[model samples]
Target: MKGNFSSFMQKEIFEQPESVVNTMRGRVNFDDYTVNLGGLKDHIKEIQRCRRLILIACGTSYHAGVATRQVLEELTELPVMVELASDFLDRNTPVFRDDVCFFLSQSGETADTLMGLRYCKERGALTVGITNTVGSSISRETDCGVHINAGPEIGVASTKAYTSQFVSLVMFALMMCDDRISMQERRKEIMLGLKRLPDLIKEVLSMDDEIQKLATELYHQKSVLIMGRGYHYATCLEGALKIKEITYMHSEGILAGELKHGPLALVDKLMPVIMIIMRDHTYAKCQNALQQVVARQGRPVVICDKEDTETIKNTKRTIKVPHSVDCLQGILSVIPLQLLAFHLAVLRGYDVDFPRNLAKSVTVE
Candidate 1:
């Protein structure tokens, strides 16, 4: 079959650094109306009073909800359950008045998500919509909501939108746990981090040659296993999604602790396992997890902090990311993954921007 060469060329042009920066600048227009801390306070009170919190979404939005679950549990000591909209709709999962349901979607018009929201509302759950689009179906359907402020995500496989969604969810979690966590310092730090991201991404992209070299070395590998802990676990899932969706690599993301549960059996010298081991509370746990993979004689590639010599010394391949605060590492760590996926897709002569069987927006569903 012939390839869509024109579409491929269009994708390449769109992924260029200049284009990415310009698109981001144009899309990120946060509403001029200030977010009232009082509204946030009422939401937190609702959360505190609720018996449970349920998060639901589809595709990458579901992945964001998964990441939010981890952050909310860590900050509030409240367990948040994530469910796919498709499953929730098909199964008719039970919802309760004491439940706070968070519906996540970029477009807010995903058919399954909207249906799932209706089901939750029918059961009397207090719902919050987390979406990029304002005044969309989810916004109108839910009791309260917050926009991701990610602007427009033009690419089929999301990059900036995912990061912005993560940041928004973490901020929401902070608001819910104000009594337990001090976010004043954290907020300032993250804002400063966001200001530095464009330049840092430019620096990170300079490693394209190095990542391309690595991609060439592993081009024939049948599959990959990506592992991480804590927030990095979300990074692992996102990174694996990039590789699988673009390069057709058959990759899967697993929590580091889950390796022994089953995935360790798939490891061997020929299988490439990527681990995110940046310095954090999970650093030591991740090291232990890598040791298990190494024991199975799996080839390990590590994405870690520049200062993490221990991981550098142990891994077969290593990529160093600039250090940032623990909470902000998710944003910093995804840059290399984006480059790696792009370079690998290019090596395989695939369209890095517009992958097959996907659209920039699934407006229909």
Candidate 2:
């Protein structure tokens, strides 16, 4: 903790801008507004015709699927289900022959995920792996797959791998919709957003010092809460996971739309809340949640777009992140939270790279 930026987790957190670009490298064609995933080229038609997309994984990888589920459903026009590998197996979920099961893991050797892949294969479903490791089990055993190419990630908490997984899956969705003339314009906008993603991520990383300041202030808090809606819901989950796993702080990611359900009861003057209200279709709904939190005397820290600042101007603590398309905004918005967790762990004198009771890879079921 004496040397703040020395941990592998910290390095990987700063390396995301480049890692994200590496994820896209040759796969996306900005000029043509098209995506070419060589791994799925031969099977594109089959994937396109699949009845459903079952995205299965564990931990951070599971959150990545939750992050991209909306966009995947939108682009492919397919029923997309995000499942935790263990739960999927415990429930003996029905996997149809026409279902495409996508397993996402940074190490590609997660025991439960590999078992899930085998289960889907035995059920006659098409299995795909999205992993950072090129030759790991999930990659080798799956029928076809895409390597996220985020480069070597030694961080147990998973910084770049999560973002890379998010990018690769989005590209996979775009690849699935490549041939559809009806999706041309929407795909074009997403492609443009992809082109700008790396720079936007770099811009967000510049706020590391600011985030560190915020973490310094909040690291001692007993618990934390993050809330968002629609696409930002994934950001809330992923961000909270980072805070919990690395900082050892109790954190909860709540859906902003569900504020009135039960979570609102926990909001109080002393509660630490981070609200992600990025400008998107869900912006107004998020504002409503913000008002409820404020009404409860919760001094929430708001994360928003530069343009959306005026809406939350009354909030004393706010983190501004650059905005992208609704689907891609989570990728940009989560970085600050990543930095926050890193700083919090470091401030509390814990190793950010390898938190207690965690491993870089879970190889046992």
Candidate 3:
């Protein structure tokens, strides 16, 4: 297979840095933690008055929710529950009048997600839509919504949309907490992180060749493993999804804390595990996890900060990223993993633009 960067898969991967710029283009002013989410501004009071938040979506969208759900929990005095749309509706979960349901999806036309919205609306719960395409089903069905301006995503395996989903939700979380005086410092930190996100993403994009070499070496491997702790556990899960969806290599995202429980038994030198060692309080713990991988002679590829090279000095392969705000590491760390997955799928002669047996929008069950 003659593969070049012109292919939709490669093109989209390279386009991601721009997608980050577009996603946050004018949405955040950062002057005073104010976010511009279009129609969502009008419903601020309603959302703030809600008792809690429940995020519902499918596939990649669900992964985005898991990534940013912590934002809402941290910034506001609200409990959050992230659920897969189909499961949320199947269980006939109680949706109170004061509860807010965030119906998230890339296509916004996902049938199960639409049904999830219907169920919430039937019980008089407030519903919000977070989608990429404007005027899509969920956008029209919900009370009010925000369109994640990541542009048109043509790849069957999502690249830009996932990060855009995360950014949009982070903005939404801050939007609800903007009026709270007690949240000032926390919001300030996040806004600073948000401002740096685009450029940090560009920094990660500059590593295309290194990631490609790693992918080339591992393309023939049968499976991949990813591990992250605390705020970046979402990174491990989402990264694995991006890899397996197109490369067709089995990938599993495991919580570092859960290693001793069962997954540790699977460690071996032939298995490649990408450990996301972001610079934060959890850094020490993740290092210990890395030591465990090395002790078992398992192959460990670490994603870490440029300043912390000494920490993973013994690892054979490492991907370095600049450090950002503590909690927002999830946004910056996933970029290299996404690029790795894209290159692997492309090098392996797979049509990543439209992977087999998969649809861009899973409209049906």
Using lDDT as the measure, the top candidate is 2
Put down candidate 2 lDDT per residue, 19-75, tens digits, no spaces: 988999889877767678899889888887789999999999999999999999888
Off by over 4 Å in 3: 1-5
lDDT of each: 0.73, 0.89, 0.84
What TM-score would every model get versus the actual structure? 0.82, 0.97, 0.95
Candidate closest to the true structure, highest TM-score? 2
What TM-score quantifies how close candidate 3 is to the native fold?
0.95
Candidate no. 1 TM-score: 0.82
- Per-residue lDDT tens digits for candidate 3, residues 1-365, read 22466566566666666776787777888665677787787888888889989999888899888888776798876999999888887798888999999988889999999999999999999999989999898999999998888888788888788888888888887787777789888888888987877778788888889998998888998988899988888889888888888889999999999998899999988888889887788888988999998899887888988888676576767888888887677777888888888889878898878888888887777
lDDT of 1 by residue, 1-365 (tens): 11453433223322434433442343232332112333244566676788788999887888777666765876666668889888888787888888889888888888888888888889888998877788899978998887766565555667766766676676666555545436545545544654565566666667767887888877787788889988787788888888887888888899999989988999998888888897878888888998898888887888888788877776658888877777767777876776677777877898766789887656665
How large is the C-alpha RMSD of every model relative to the true structure? Answer: 4.9, 1.8, 2.2
- In model 3, pairs of residues that clash are none
